[PDB]
Short mmCIF file of C-alpha atoms and ligand atoms in Angstrom, two decimals:
data_model
loop_
_atom_site.label_atom_id
_atom_site.label_comp_id
_atom_site.label_asym_id
_atom_site.label_seq_id
_atom_site.Cartn_x
_atom_site.Cartn_y
_atom_site.Cartn_z
CA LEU C 1 73.81 99.20 71.92
CA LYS C 2 76.75 96.77 72.01
CA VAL C 3 78.86 96.76 75.17
CA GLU C 4 82.64 96.99 74.88
CA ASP C 5 83.57 94.39 77.49
CA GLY C 6 85.17 91.49 75.64
CA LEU C 7 88.70 90.60 74.57
CA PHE C 8 90.74 93.81 74.90
CA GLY C 9 87.48 95.74 75.23
CA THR C 10 85.93 94.50 71.99
CA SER C 11 82.17 94.49 71.44
CA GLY C 12 82.09 91.40 69.23
CA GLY C 13 81.20 89.11 72.12
CA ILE C 14 84.60 87.43 72.16
CA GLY C 15 86.45 86.75 75.41
CA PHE C 16 85.76 85.77 79.01
CA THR C 17 82.53 86.48 80.86
CA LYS C 18 82.65 87.54 84.51
CA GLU C 19 81.87 83.91 85.39
CA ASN C 20 84.92 82.57 83.55
CA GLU C 21 87.02 85.24 85.24
CA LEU C 22 85.61 84.21 88.60
CA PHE C 23 86.48 80.55 88.00
CA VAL C 24 90.03 81.34 86.86
CA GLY C 25 90.16 83.49 89.98
CA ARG C 26 89.24 80.52 92.17
CA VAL C 27 91.93 78.38 90.57
CA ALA C 28 94.38 81.21 91.19
CA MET C 29 93.35 81.48 94.85
CA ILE C 30 93.92 77.76 95.34
CA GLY C 31 97.21 77.78 93.41
CA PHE C 32 98.60 80.79 95.26
CA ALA C 33 97.57 79.56 98.71
CA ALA C 34 98.97 76.11 97.91
CA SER C 35 102.17 77.79 96.75
CA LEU C 36 102.57 79.60 100.07
CA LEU C 37 101.60 76.53 102.09
CA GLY C 38 103.84 74.32 99.95
CA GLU C 39 106.80 76.60 100.52
CA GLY C 40 106.04 76.52 104.23
CA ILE C 41 106.20 72.73 104.15
CA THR C 42 109.10 72.12 101.76
CA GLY C 43 111.16 75.29 102.26
CA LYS C 44 111.25 75.75 98.48
CA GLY C 45 109.29 77.96 96.09
CA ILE C 46 106.63 76.33 93.92
CA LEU C 47 108.77 76.48 90.77
CA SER C 48 111.64 74.79 92.61
CA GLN C 49 109.14 72.23 93.94
CA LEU C 50 108.04 71.50 90.38
CA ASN C 51 111.75 71.40 89.53
CA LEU C 52 111.62 74.34 87.13
CA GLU C 53 114.85 76.32 86.68
CA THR C 54 115.06 79.37 88.97
CA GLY C 55 117.47 82.20 89.75
CA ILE C 56 117.66 82.85 86.02
CA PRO C 57 116.81 85.69 83.63
CA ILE C 58 113.18 85.80 82.45
CA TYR C 59 113.97 84.94 78.81
CA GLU C 60 115.51 81.62 79.90
CA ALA C 61 112.42 80.58 81.87
CA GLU C 62 110.01 77.95 80.55
CA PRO C 63 107.82 79.44 77.77
CA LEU C 64 104.74 77.72 79.22
CA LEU C 65 105.45 79.31 82.60
CA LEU C 66 105.91 82.68 80.90
CA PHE C 67 102.70 82.32 78.89
CA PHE C 68 100.96 81.33 82.12
CA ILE C 69 102.24 84.49 83.80
CA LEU C 70 101.10 86.56 80.84
CA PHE C 71 97.70 84.84 80.87
CA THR C 72 97.30 85.40 84.62
CA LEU C 73 98.27 89.08 84.36
CA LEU C 74 96.03 89.83 81.37
CA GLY C 75 93.27 87.96 83.18
CA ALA C 76 93.65 89.98 86.37
CA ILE C 77 93.06 93.24 84.49
CA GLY C 78 90.15 91.75 82.54
CA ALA C 79 91.91 92.03 79.19
CA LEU C 80 90.75 88.56 78.18
CA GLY C 81 87.07 89.42 78.52
CA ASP C 82 84.88 90.98 81.19
CA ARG C 83 81.43 90.33 79.72
CA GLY C 84 78.10 90.66 81.51
CA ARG C 85 77.59 91.95 85.04
CA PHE C 86 77.19 90.81 88.63
CA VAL C 87 74.08 92.27 90.27
CA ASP C 88 72.58 92.02 93.76
CA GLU C 89 69.84 89.40 93.89
CA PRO C 90 66.54 91.24 94.51
CA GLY C 91 78.33 87.87 103.17
CA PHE C 92 80.68 88.09 100.17
CA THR C 93 79.16 88.88 96.78
CA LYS C 94 80.38 87.25 93.57
CA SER C 95 82.06 90.54 92.64
CA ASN C 96 84.01 90.52 95.91
CA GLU C 97 85.00 86.98 94.99
CA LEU C 98 86.10 88.21 91.56
CA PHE C 99 88.36 90.83 93.15
CA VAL C 100 89.82 88.42 95.71
CA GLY C 101 90.62 86.21 92.72
CA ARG C 102 92.18 89.15 90.89
CA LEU C 103 94.35 89.94 93.92
CA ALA C 104 95.32 86.27 93.98
CA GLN C 105 96.22 86.43 90.28
CA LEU C 106 98.37 89.53 90.80
CA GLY C 107 100.21 88.14 93.82
CA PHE C 108 100.69 84.79 92.11
CA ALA C 109 102.18 86.24 88.92
CA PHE C 110 104.34 88.60 90.98
CA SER C 111 105.77 85.83 93.18
CA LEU C 112 106.37 83.70 90.08
CA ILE C 113 108.39 86.39 88.31
CA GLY C 114 110.25 87.03 91.56
CA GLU C 115 111.10 83.36 91.94
CA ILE C 116 112.29 83.22 88.33
CA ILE C 117 114.64 86.18 88.77
CA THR C 118 115.86 85.56 92.33
CA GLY C 119 115.20 81.88 93.04
CA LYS C 120 113.16 82.64 96.16
CA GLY C 121 109.54 81.74 96.87
CA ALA C 122 106.70 84.01 97.97
CA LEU C 123 107.51 83.55 101.66
CA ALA C 124 111.16 84.59 101.42
CA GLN C 125 110.06 87.35 99.06
CA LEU C 126 107.66 88.61 101.73
CA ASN C 127 110.43 88.46 104.33
CA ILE C 128 112.72 90.59 102.15
CA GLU C 129 109.83 92.90 101.16
CA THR C 130 108.93 93.65 104.77
CA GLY C 131 112.13 92.97 106.71
CA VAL C 132 110.18 90.85 109.18
CA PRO C 133 111.51 87.37 110.09
CA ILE C 134 109.75 84.28 108.71
CA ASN C 135 108.56 82.96 112.09
CA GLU C 136 106.56 86.15 112.63
CA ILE C 137 105.28 86.23 109.05
CA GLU C 138 103.92 82.66 108.83
CA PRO C 139 100.96 83.17 111.19
CA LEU C 140 99.72 86.04 109.01
CA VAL C 141 100.32 84.15 105.77
CA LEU C 142 98.54 81.09 107.18
CA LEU C 143 95.54 83.30 107.95
CA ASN C 144 95.81 84.55 104.36
CA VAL C 145 96.02 81.01 102.99
CA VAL C 146 92.90 80.02 104.93
CA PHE C 147 91.03 83.06 103.60
CA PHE C 148 92.05 82.14 100.05
CA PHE C 149 90.88 78.55 100.46
CA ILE C 150 87.63 79.81 102.00
CA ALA C 151 87.02 82.32 99.21
CA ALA C 152 87.94 79.83 96.48
CA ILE C 153 85.08 77.55 97.53
CA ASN C 154 82.60 80.23 98.62
CA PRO C 155 79.90 80.59 95.92
CA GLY C 156 79.20 84.25 96.68
CA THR C 157 75.82 85.99 96.63
CA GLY C 158 74.24 87.59 93.56
CA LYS C 159 73.44 86.62 89.97
CA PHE C 160 75.14 87.05 86.58
CA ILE C 161 73.38 89.00 83.82
CA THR C 162 74.48 89.06 80.19
CA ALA E 1 48.84 116.45 79.23
CA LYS E 2 49.25 114.28 82.34
CA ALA E 3 51.68 111.40 81.82
CA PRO E 4 50.46 107.83 82.40
CA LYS E 5 52.04 106.48 85.59
CA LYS E 6 54.75 103.96 84.73
CA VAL E 7 55.10 100.90 86.97
CA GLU E 8 58.40 100.40 88.81
CA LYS E 9 60.03 97.34 87.26
CA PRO E 10 62.72 95.64 89.44
CA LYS E 11 65.84 97.83 89.58
CA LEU E 12 69.38 96.68 88.74
CA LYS E 13 71.87 97.20 91.56
CA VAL E 14 75.17 96.48 89.81
CA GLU E 15 78.19 95.12 91.67
CA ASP E 16 80.85 97.24 89.97
CA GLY E 17 82.11 99.69 92.60
CA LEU E 18 84.95 99.79 95.11
CA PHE E 19 85.99 96.14 95.51
CA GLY E 20 82.79 95.05 93.78
CA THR E 21 80.31 96.92 95.95
CA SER E 22 76.91 97.98 94.59
CA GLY E 23 76.33 101.10 96.68
CA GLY E 24 77.71 103.29 93.91
CA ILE E 25 80.99 104.02 95.68
CA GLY E 26 84.15 103.96 93.57
CA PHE E 27 85.70 105.05 90.28
CA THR E 28 83.71 105.05 87.04
CA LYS E 29 85.18 103.75 83.78
CA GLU E 30 85.80 107.40 82.88
CA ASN E 31 87.84 108.02 86.04
CA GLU E 32 89.77 104.81 85.44
CA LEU E 33 90.37 105.93 81.87
CA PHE E 34 91.79 109.27 83.04
CA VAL E 35 94.09 107.70 85.63
CA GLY E 36 95.06 105.34 82.83
CA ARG E 37 96.05 108.27 80.64
CA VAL E 38 98.14 109.67 83.48
CA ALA E 39 99.83 106.28 83.78
CA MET E 40 100.51 106.16 80.04
CA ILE E 41 102.12 109.60 80.19
CA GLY E 42 104.17 108.77 83.28
CA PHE E 43 105.35 105.44 81.87
CA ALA E 44 106.34 106.87 78.48
CA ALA E 45 108.10 109.75 80.22
CA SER E 46 109.97 107.24 82.38
CA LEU E 47 111.11 105.18 79.39
CA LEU E 48 112.03 108.22 77.27
CA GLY E 49 113.72 110.07 80.14
CA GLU E 50 115.86 107.07 81.00
CA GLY E 51 116.53 106.45 77.32
CA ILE E 52 118.02 109.93 77.05
CA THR E 53 119.65 110.30 80.48
CA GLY E 54 120.49 106.71 81.42
CA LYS E 55 118.85 107.11 84.83
CA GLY E 56 115.62 105.71 86.24
CA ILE E 57 112.69 108.03 86.89
CA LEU E 58 112.93 107.56 90.67
CA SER E 59 116.62 108.45 90.52
CA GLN E 60 115.59 111.53 88.54
CA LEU E 61 112.93 112.44 91.12
CA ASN E 62 115.59 112.17 93.85
CA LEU E 63 114.33 109.01 95.54
CA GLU E 64 116.46 106.25 97.07
CA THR E 65 116.76 103.28 94.72
CA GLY E 66 118.50 99.97 95.38
CA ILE E 67 116.71 99.60 98.71
CA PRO E 68 114.23 97.12 100.15
CA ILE E 69 110.53 97.93 99.68
CA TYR E 70 109.87 98.85 103.32
CA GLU E 71 112.65 101.47 103.46
CA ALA E 72 111.03 103.28 100.52
CA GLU E 73 109.02 106.50 100.79
CA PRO E 74 105.44 105.55 101.84
CA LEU E 75 103.94 107.89 99.21
CA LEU E 76 105.71 105.90 96.49
CA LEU E 77 104.45 102.63 97.96
CA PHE E 78 100.95 104.06 98.20
CA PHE E 79 101.14 105.26 94.60
CA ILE E 80 102.20 101.77 93.48
CA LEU E 81 99.39 100.14 95.47
CA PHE E 82 96.92 102.66 94.03
CA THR E 83 98.10 101.92 90.49
CA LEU E 84 97.90 98.16 91.01
CA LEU E 85 94.40 98.25 92.53
CA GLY E 86 93.31 100.62 89.76
CA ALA E 87 94.60 98.28 87.06
CA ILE E 88 92.37 95.44 88.28
CA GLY E 89 89.41 97.78 88.72
CA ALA E 90 89.44 97.27 92.48
CA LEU E 91 88.89 100.98 93.12
CA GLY E 92 85.73 101.01 91.03
CA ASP E 93 84.73 100.08 87.49
CA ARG E 94 81.23 101.58 87.48
CA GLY E 95 79.36 101.87 84.19
CA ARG E 96 79.92 100.59 80.67
CA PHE E 97 81.56 101.70 77.44
CA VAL E 98 79.32 101.00 74.45
CA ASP E 99 79.54 101.46 70.69
CA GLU E 100 77.75 104.49 69.28
CA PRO E 101 74.84 103.68 66.92
CA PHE E 102 88.20 102.99 62.84
CA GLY E 103 90.65 103.70 65.66
CA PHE E 104 90.61 102.72 69.33
CA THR E 105 87.32 102.57 71.23
CA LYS E 106 87.10 103.97 74.77
CA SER E 107 87.44 100.41 76.06
CA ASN E 108 90.60 99.81 74.04
CA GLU E 109 92.00 103.01 75.53
CA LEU E 110 91.03 101.75 78.99
CA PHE E 111 92.97 98.52 78.46
CA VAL E 112 96.03 100.30 77.05
CA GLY E 113 95.77 102.35 80.23
CA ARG E 114 95.68 99.24 82.40
CA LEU E 115 98.67 97.68 80.63
CA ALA E 116 100.46 100.98 81.23
CA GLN E 117 99.51 100.88 84.91
CA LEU E 118 100.80 97.32 85.27
CA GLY E 119 104.10 97.96 83.51
CA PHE E 120 104.58 101.23 85.37
CA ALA E 121 104.01 99.74 88.82
CA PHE E 122 106.27 96.79 87.99
CA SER E 123 109.03 99.07 86.70
CA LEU E 124 108.78 101.22 89.83
CA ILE E 125 109.00 98.24 92.20
CA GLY E 126 111.93 96.91 90.20
CA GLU E 127 113.71 100.26 90.28
CA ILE E 128 113.17 100.44 94.03
CA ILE E 129 114.72 97.03 94.68
CA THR E 130 117.46 96.84 92.02
CA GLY E 131 118.27 100.50 91.38
CA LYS E 132 117.71 100.23 87.64
CA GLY E 133 115.11 102.09 85.59
CA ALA E 134 112.52 100.51 83.30
CA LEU E 135 114.84 100.47 80.27
CA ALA E 136 117.72 98.71 82.04
CA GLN E 137 115.16 96.31 83.52
CA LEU E 138 113.89 95.53 80.01
CA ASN E 139 117.49 94.96 78.91
CA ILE E 140 118.01 92.38 81.67
CA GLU E 141 114.56 90.81 81.17
CA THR E 142 114.82 90.20 77.44
CA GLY E 143 118.60 89.96 77.12
CA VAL E 144 118.31 92.32 74.17
CA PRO E 145 121.12 94.94 74.16
CA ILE E 146 120.26 98.59 74.90
CA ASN E 147 120.99 99.64 71.31
CA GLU E 148 118.56 97.08 69.90
CA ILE E 149 115.92 97.64 72.59
CA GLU E 150 115.83 101.47 72.31
CA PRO E 151 113.95 101.77 69.01
CA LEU E 152 111.23 99.39 70.21
CA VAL E 153 110.87 101.37 73.44
CA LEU E 154 110.70 104.65 71.52
CA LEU E 155 107.91 103.08 69.45
CA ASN E 156 106.15 102.16 72.70
CA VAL E 157 106.72 105.71 73.96
CA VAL E 158 105.09 107.25 70.89
CA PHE E 159 102.30 104.66 71.14
CA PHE E 160 101.54 105.56 74.77
CA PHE E 161 101.75 109.33 74.17
CA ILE E 162 99.28 109.24 71.27
CA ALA E 163 96.90 106.95 73.16
CA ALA E 164 97.06 109.27 76.17
CA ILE E 165 95.75 112.10 74.01
CA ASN E 166 93.24 109.98 72.08
CA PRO E 167 89.70 110.09 73.60
CA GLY E 168 88.53 106.90 71.86
CA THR E 169 85.20 106.19 70.19
CA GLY E 170 82.00 105.20 71.99
CA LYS E 171 80.03 106.59 74.93
CA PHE E 172 79.71 106.03 78.69
CA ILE E 173 76.56 104.55 80.27
CA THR E 174 75.32 103.94 83.82
C1 BNG Y 201 98.15 80.63 76.99
C2 BNG Y 201 96.72 81.13 76.97
C3 BNG Y 201 95.88 80.87 75.71
C4 BNG Y 201 94.37 81.13 75.80
C5 BNG Y 201 93.84 82.49 75.40
C6 BNG Y 201 92.38 82.81 75.73
C7 BNG Y 201 91.66 83.90 74.90
C8 BNG Y 201 90.23 84.28 75.32
C9 BNG Y 201 89.06 83.58 74.62
O1 BNG Y 201 87.90 83.43 75.35
C10 BNG Y 201 86.88 82.61 74.90
O2 BNG Y 201 86.18 83.31 73.90
C11 BNG Y 201 84.77 82.90 73.69
C12 BNG Y 201 84.14 83.81 72.70
O3 BNG Y 201 82.81 84.19 72.92
C13 BNG Y 201 84.00 82.88 74.99
O4 BNG Y 201 82.66 82.44 74.75
C14 BNG Y 201 84.60 81.99 75.92
O5 BNG Y 201 83.93 82.12 77.21
C15 BNG Y 201 86.06 82.17 76.12
O6 BNG Y 201 86.61 80.97 76.62
C1 BNG Y 202 95.12 76.59 83.33
C2 BNG Y 202 94.01 76.65 84.36
C3 BNG Y 202 93.00 77.81 84.27
C4 BNG Y 202 92.27 78.02 82.95
C5 BNG Y 202 90.76 77.83 82.92
C6 BNG Y 202 89.95 78.80 82.05
C7 BNG Y 202 88.66 78.27 81.38
C8 BNG Y 202 87.41 79.17 81.43
C9 BNG Y 202 86.04 78.47 81.51
O1 BNG Y 202 85.15 78.90 82.47
C10 BNG Y 202 84.76 78.03 83.46
O2 BNG Y 202 85.06 76.72 83.05
C11 BNG Y 202 84.43 75.61 83.81
C12 BNG Y 202 84.34 74.44 82.92
O3 BNG Y 202 84.42 74.68 81.55
C13 BNG Y 202 83.04 75.88 84.39
O4 BNG Y 202 82.87 75.07 85.55
C14 BNG Y 202 82.82 77.24 84.76
O5 BNG Y 202 81.41 77.46 85.06
C15 BNG Y 202 83.27 78.20 83.73
O6 BNG Y 202 82.99 79.52 84.12
C1 BNG Y 203 100.43 70.50 87.17
C2 BNG Y 203 100.52 71.94 87.60
C3 BNG Y 203 101.50 72.59 86.66
C4 BNG Y 203 102.20 71.47 85.93
C5 BNG Y 203 103.46 71.09 86.65
C6 BNG Y 203 104.45 70.47 85.68
C7 BNG Y 203 105.85 71.05 85.81
C8 BNG Y 203 106.88 69.94 85.85
C9 BNG Y 203 108.06 70.28 84.99
O1 BNG Y 203 109.03 69.28 85.15
C10 BNG Y 203 110.30 69.80 84.89
O2 BNG Y 203 110.26 70.30 83.59
C11 BNG Y 203 111.51 70.86 83.25
C12 BNG Y 203 111.43 71.65 81.98
O3 BNG Y 203 111.38 73.02 82.35
C13 BNG Y 203 112.54 69.78 83.12
O4 BNG Y 203 113.77 70.40 82.90
C14 BNG Y 203 112.67 69.13 84.46
O5 BNG Y 203 113.57 68.04 84.33
C15 BNG Y 203 111.30 68.68 84.91
O6 BNG Y 203 111.40 68.22 86.25
C1 BNG Y 204 96.85 109.62 90.92
C2 BNG Y 204 97.07 110.33 89.60
C3 BNG Y 204 95.82 110.79 88.82
C4 BNG Y 204 94.93 111.86 89.46
C5 BNG Y 204 93.42 111.68 89.38
C6 BNG Y 204 92.78 110.54 90.17
C7 BNG Y 204 91.28 110.65 90.53
C8 BNG Y 204 90.25 110.57 89.39
C9 BNG Y 204 89.74 111.88 88.77
O1 BNG Y 204 88.84 111.80 87.72
C10 BNG Y 204 89.06 112.53 86.57
O2 BNG Y 204 89.61 113.78 86.90
C11 BNG Y 204 89.75 114.71 85.75
C12 BNG Y 204 90.16 116.04 86.22
O3 BNG Y 204 90.18 117.08 85.29
C13 BNG Y 204 88.48 114.82 84.91
O4 BNG Y 204 88.77 115.51 83.70
C14 BNG Y 204 87.94 113.54 84.59
O5 BNG Y 204 86.67 113.69 83.89
C15 BNG Y 204 87.77 112.66 85.77
O6 BNG Y 204 87.33 111.39 85.37
N1 DCW Y 205 106.51 91.13 97.31
C1 DCW Y 205 107.36 90.96 96.18
O1 DCW Y 205 107.23 90.00 95.44
N2 DCW Y 205 108.37 91.94 95.93
C2 DCW Y 205 109.29 91.89 94.85
C3 DCW Y 205 110.24 90.72 95.06
C4 DCW Y 205 111.21 90.62 93.91
C5 DCW Y 205 110.43 90.38 92.64
C6 DCW Y 205 109.53 91.57 92.38
C7 DCW Y 205 108.56 91.78 93.52
C8 DCW Y 205 105.45 90.22 97.64
C9 DCW Y 205 105.99 88.81 97.87
C10 DCW Y 205 105.16 87.78 97.14
C11 DCW Y 205 103.71 88.05 97.45
C12 DCW Y 205 103.28 89.28 96.67
C13 DCW Y 205 104.39 90.30 96.55
N1 DCW Y 206 110.49 93.64 85.95
C1 DCW Y 206 110.78 92.79 84.85
O1 DCW Y 206 111.27 91.70 85.09
N2 DCW Y 206 110.50 93.14 83.50
C2 DCW Y 206 109.91 94.37 83.06
C3 DCW Y 206 108.48 94.52 83.54
C4 DCW Y 206 107.88 95.73 82.85
C5 DCW Y 206 108.67 96.98 83.19
C6 DCW Y 206 110.13 96.81 82.81
C7 DCW Y 206 110.70 95.59 83.50
C8 DCW Y 206 110.82 93.19 87.25
C9 DCW Y 206 109.82 93.76 88.25
C10 DCW Y 206 110.31 93.65 89.68
C11 DCW Y 206 111.53 92.75 89.77
C12 DCW Y 206 112.64 93.41 89.00
C13 DCW Y 206 112.24 93.62 87.56
HG1 HG Y 207 120.48 83.75 78.20
HG1 HG Y 208 114.31 93.50 103.95
HG1 HG Y 209 75.50 92.77 79.08
HG1 HG Y 210 50.52 118.53 79.80
HG1 HG Y 211 115.02 98.49 107.45
HG1 HG Y 212 119.41 88.74 80.57
HG1 HG Y 213 75.09 100.84 84.74
#
């Protein structure tokens, strides 16, 4: 009778609902897009912009940053709760939104770890990942940033059922 | 003898398929669970194999490590992408695991599987770029020496191997 969809798959009703996940997803979309944009403007990664130590081993990074990365990662895989469902109401649905937000969470956490280890932001990371110069990569990232801002605000169609 | 006709109550079209679709296309929680088991096995084998041989799994499988991502074999990249999308349920998460009317439940197993998928993909990317397997990576990450990190990894290996075999309690429902 009880669904196993809470914290770490529990059935006790503890943990995030799909709505909470969606919200955190929106915040992640905005944060990630603003990280990319911000690096485009300032030429520095978001951690360096916030004046957090970079180009260092993970264990020397700020514990709050590390716990934020852990939180983001565990959130992306729904380990903090995935309660209830999104159903079609009898062009993006709220589930699509949820997955855009999960992609955002993944990419964000990734770029953060990368900036901790190497000292380079998501843009430079993309350049080294692909081997394509920055000037050719910025128009695509800008399109991505716009999409993230759009999705972050887009309500999405469908309702949430416990 | 003849059954009373039951009236069609509004149907529930759930958005839990491939990238959240409702058309019923994508993995079920059972599929995800299986792929998760495969990831547990692969990850534990990577950690153990490196622990014994001192070489990363990609080095063992005769793949170029210490290269940029784009120069890497496209099947490896595709496997990593597949694992990452699977971990977040992007490839489908159809259905539910429910309690049956004291070990791991099927859902717990699913999440151990997703953690395994995450860690595996990360370790593979890292080995591609740096040329160091998961164990060496852990050593650099934590700053804990190999000798002090090995027992904890072995524990994690045994944990993943047992979980991979364990079916978990509960049943699957659409
Ligand atoms: C550094 C990160 C620290 C925070 C860890 C978050 C753990 C998840 C708890 O979830 C909460 O549990 C309630 C129980 O029902 C829900 O009702 C509620 O929606 C949700 O907010
Ligand atoms: C560190 C930044 C990110 C952490 C935020 C996680 C909190 C989860 C709560 O859920 C959301 O909270 C809002 C207000 O409580 C509501 O507007 C929204 O409807 C609800 O779904
Ligand atoms: C608001 C979105 C996220 C919060 C941003 C706050 C991060 C600002 C951190 O400041 C930096 O903290 C360092 C400690 O690591 C100090 O060493 C350094 O001198 C200081 O500049
Ligand atoms: C990429 C590495 C992993 C390979 C499999 C990925 C596709 C999902 C297949 O589904 C699973 O296949 C098993 C085959 O026997 C079944 O037992 C099981 O019931 C079923 O859920
Ligand atoms: N690629 C990326 O981050 N690759 C590596 C870089 C070193 C750290 C590990 C990952 C992309 C760039 C940022 C956007 C998402 C990933
Ligand atoms: N990995 C890392 O920093 N720590 C762990 C992550 C789990 C698997 C073992 C390594 C990084 C990922 C890519 C950048 C290089 C290492
Ligand atoms: Hg240190
Ligand atoms: Hg490159
Ligand atoms: Hg429910
Ligand atoms: Hg009959
Ligand atoms: Hg190249
Ligand atoms: Hg270190
Ligand atoms: Hg269902």
